[PDB]
Amino acid sequence: LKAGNFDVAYQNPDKAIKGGNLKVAYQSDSPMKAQWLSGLSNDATFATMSGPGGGQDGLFFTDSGFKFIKGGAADVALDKESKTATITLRKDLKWSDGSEVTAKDYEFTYETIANPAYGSDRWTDSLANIVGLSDYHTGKAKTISGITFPDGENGKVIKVQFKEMKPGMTQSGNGYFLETVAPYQYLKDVAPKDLASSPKTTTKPLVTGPFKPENVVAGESIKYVPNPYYWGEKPKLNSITYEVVSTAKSVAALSSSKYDIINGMVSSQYKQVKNLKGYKVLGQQAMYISLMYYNLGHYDAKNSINVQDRKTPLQDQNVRQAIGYARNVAEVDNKFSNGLSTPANSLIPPIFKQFTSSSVKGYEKQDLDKANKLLDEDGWKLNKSTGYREKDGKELSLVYAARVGDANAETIAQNYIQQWKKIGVKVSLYNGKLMEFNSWVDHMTTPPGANDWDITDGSWSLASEPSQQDLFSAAAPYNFGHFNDSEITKDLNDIDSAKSENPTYRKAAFVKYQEDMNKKAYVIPTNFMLNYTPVNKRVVGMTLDYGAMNTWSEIGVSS
């Protein structure tokens, strides 16, 4: 398995010893916030650090494309005809204290999120598709009517009844049903308003994973030890320590071999890491897309609809395409990215092999000739005097709301401005400088939208169900440029249709959608990215493969 030039796995030539201690860090300049219940946890640092303990008690295995498979802590089965997900917990699925994981523990997850008394931030509208769940969430019902227990609360089976099935229900991270358990017998006497701050969910939790946390130092670290009651394969290691390390100390920690693995390192430090003797640097395709938006309308919040009514030359498809073909994204990546940004051909990242294809062509190759011809054949005629194009007497001049974020953000934005000058388009920065991120978010997300930018960049960390509805549909507030296109709406609906329960049909629908988006060019894909992880050469069985389900049990050290 490769990811760009990177290996996905470190194939250690040496055999693992029995036992050993693995030293893992997560790069963060902020303290971790320990919260073992998925529904109550809002800190990405700790979510990742919870890995050895079960990742906040996730139930389901997937393949490398995040499609559910059987054989994890539980199985999930979908039945179209009865509109039901059936969750079957393993007979020997236990909490770390030896107590049984039961149907009630699965249902209780739902209460931690949907009952506002616990203070979760994780309710989504998607959950309203479970029968009875909205009524629970608003306090109209004392129980969740769509969740039933064929063999009782102390049984191992849970049925979840939906109003409508969705084809994304076979992908982890779909959000239509939840994928974690909570130890109801351990927590049932804690007041909901006190659950998040209780020892029992912070320093002294029950877990289901291959390791349990023997010690938690708040903000800093976890000492993991084998969980005797884990249903699966007993781990090789005697322990794992998992700590936060600051950005400024990460490279030195590798130099001294303080950590066997550091997770979450940022793209800029890669040049300092690549050279380090004693480490293998692994890479993996990220669940990430960056793209360029054009401002084409406004958002009507009252009616929840994007209206594509902005006066701008970007209403012309030829202009949108030309501005895309003019960029030198490949060249930019080659100068600056260390192979960690690679040009996007489409809106769906290539890690989703079941939902995209490299055969989709976008704007990944600069074509200044094509850009110039497009503007020509559309009446944007160049000047002698100025080097810029005019049409019905008005100059082709646009505002670029570029933003701070990338370590060469200023240099990249200027490079694009210069490329656009080559095709006779005059582009200037919004207020003559890069936008701060919080400014940029406010500008793009406050309805009805501003009229004072033409081009901007966005970048998303995608869930493992790569839903496009929430980003680009006619009703989406995140449709930042406010396009509204009947063909794209049809394409989006087809992706989520009953016909798309068939994987081959769904792939085709995703592919058509990506083609249509590139042609229409309301937005332009910019980059995919790779994540990297340095791994000490003594570690055995380490891999970034998303389909690797037992890495914490398999991983060992050679000395």
Binding site: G173, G175, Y288, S459, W460, S461, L462, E465, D470
Partner: peptide
Amino acid sequence: AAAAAA
């Protein structure tokens, strides 16, 4: 509610 800025 699935995807995040980043």
